[PDB]
Ligand binder design. Structure first.
Ligand SMILES: [Fe+2]
Ligand SMILES: [Fe+2]
Lengths: 258, 257
């Protein structure tokens, strides 16, 4: 590892200095970043004054790009979730580049699902092994108070199923596939499934599993949805402007770099 | 005078040396009521009293709630709530007398809604003052995955409204009326109301506001629903025996001793 890696948290997040992401990275550098993400699933590249084309070009090195509603997305993102876990093909890495940072609040917080899995009480460890869960965007929106959706969107975003205990392809780490999108456990009565997910979510978002990112202008933050949940925090006052540019890659295990 | 021993600096205290098998004097009931103004959780150790004596003790503090599902109650009790907040006339004090205590887990946890109100960030303090919330047992049961209810029960337990900021009649303390039964804010769009209650509930149940009661056999725990949320914790294994006898008084402010 020749990358200049500086831990921002002992195991969730790290800064990577000395990169100019306005230029395409070499293949060896992209691999190094992937390896660094296996240790720290949140990577912060400070002071990246890049435009959207360059942001998208950087993101596209790690997977295929994902191809009112501002109010809805703002409020639902305040709940712990993993990006696009409600899709059969969820997100791989997500990317957020800050343009304008509010003075108070507005953190993005990250919860380590590997650490949460590792620290589970023995009886919960035994219970989660081999389970699968239902993931349902319309149910999670309804829980946040949003009930309006076209029949086309409901069909296009029909609920799916994912295994609860994941194994990361880079690091081999086991982790919990928690998300606000997960409703209950496949093959279990709904109440017992909801209660298990309630208990796991409270456990996995205790402070020892959480890194709270205090944003700086032009931070590029890249996070691995395969190992995390994340959420946005309100900024105070809400009238302050907060401008973030986003890109998302999909976890297509058949995709290959060039 | 009352022998009060704090179990937590401001949430809970033990009261020693009382024999609750016999009726208490009026002066003694006033002493307990006033002490509950300081400590909303009161613990009476080693109360070997039968159900009649437990009910008579509870009846000194308000009128008893009459009844009108073990799986459902077991799972919903693990969520933070305030007893009978889904009724237009909610609970005053609840009472729990332990008979059989499991070795691992099974704590009852209590979150001080007065302390939570006191510590609110200024911007949240300003927002909550005049608010009201909808309280809806069928919605909270559905949120836990329970959808079966007769049309008769749905009518008998129809949603109601309570103020978000309470003022306690004994202590004058302000507190947040949080509960799993509360769905959203009256007169607000649902998403903004749900999000406020989410933020408040997370803030109000952080560890600095919580007392976790480790049960002892024949503990009689009396707690003031007007100032708290509470929840049960699973015991491990769930097959271990756990026996608790319960009584509930209603916050009927037309009632007098
Ligand atoms: Fe997100
Ligand atoms: Fe209760």
């Amino acid at each position: 590892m020749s990358l200049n890696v500086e831990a921002a948290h002992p195991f969730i997040a790290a800064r990577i200095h000395g990169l100019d992401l306005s230029k395409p990275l070499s293949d060896e550098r992209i691999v190094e970043i992937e390896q660094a993400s296996g240790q720290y699933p949140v990577l912060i590249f400070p002071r990246q004054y890049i435009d959207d084309d360059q942001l998208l070009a950087f993101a596209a090195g790690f997977g295929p790009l994902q191809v009112d509603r501002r109010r809805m997305n703002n409020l639902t993102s305040r709940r712990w979730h993993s990006d696009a876990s409600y899709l059969p093909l969820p997100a791989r890495y997500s990317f957020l580049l800050s343009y304008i940072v509010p003075a108070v609040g507005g953190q993005t917080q990250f919860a380590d699902m590997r650490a949460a899995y590792d620290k589970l009480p023995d009886h919960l460890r035994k219970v989660v092994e081999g389970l699968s869960c239902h993931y349902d965007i319309m149910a999670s929106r309804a829980a946040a108070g949003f009930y309006d959706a076209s029949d086309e969107e409901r069909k296009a975003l029909a609920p799916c199923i994912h295994e609860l205990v994941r194994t990361h392809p880079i690091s081999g780490r086991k982790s919990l596939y928690l998300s606000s999108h997960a409703t209950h456990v496949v093959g279990w009565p709904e109440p017992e499934g909801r209660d298990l997910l309630r208990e796991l979510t409270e456990f996995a978002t205790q402070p020892q599993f959480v890194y709270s990112h205090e944003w700086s202008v032009r931070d590029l933050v890249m996070w691995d949805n395969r190992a995390l949940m994340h959420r946005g925090r309100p900024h105070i006052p809400e009238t302050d402007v907060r401008e973030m540019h986003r890109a998302t890659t999909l976890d297509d295990r058949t995709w290959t770099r060039g």
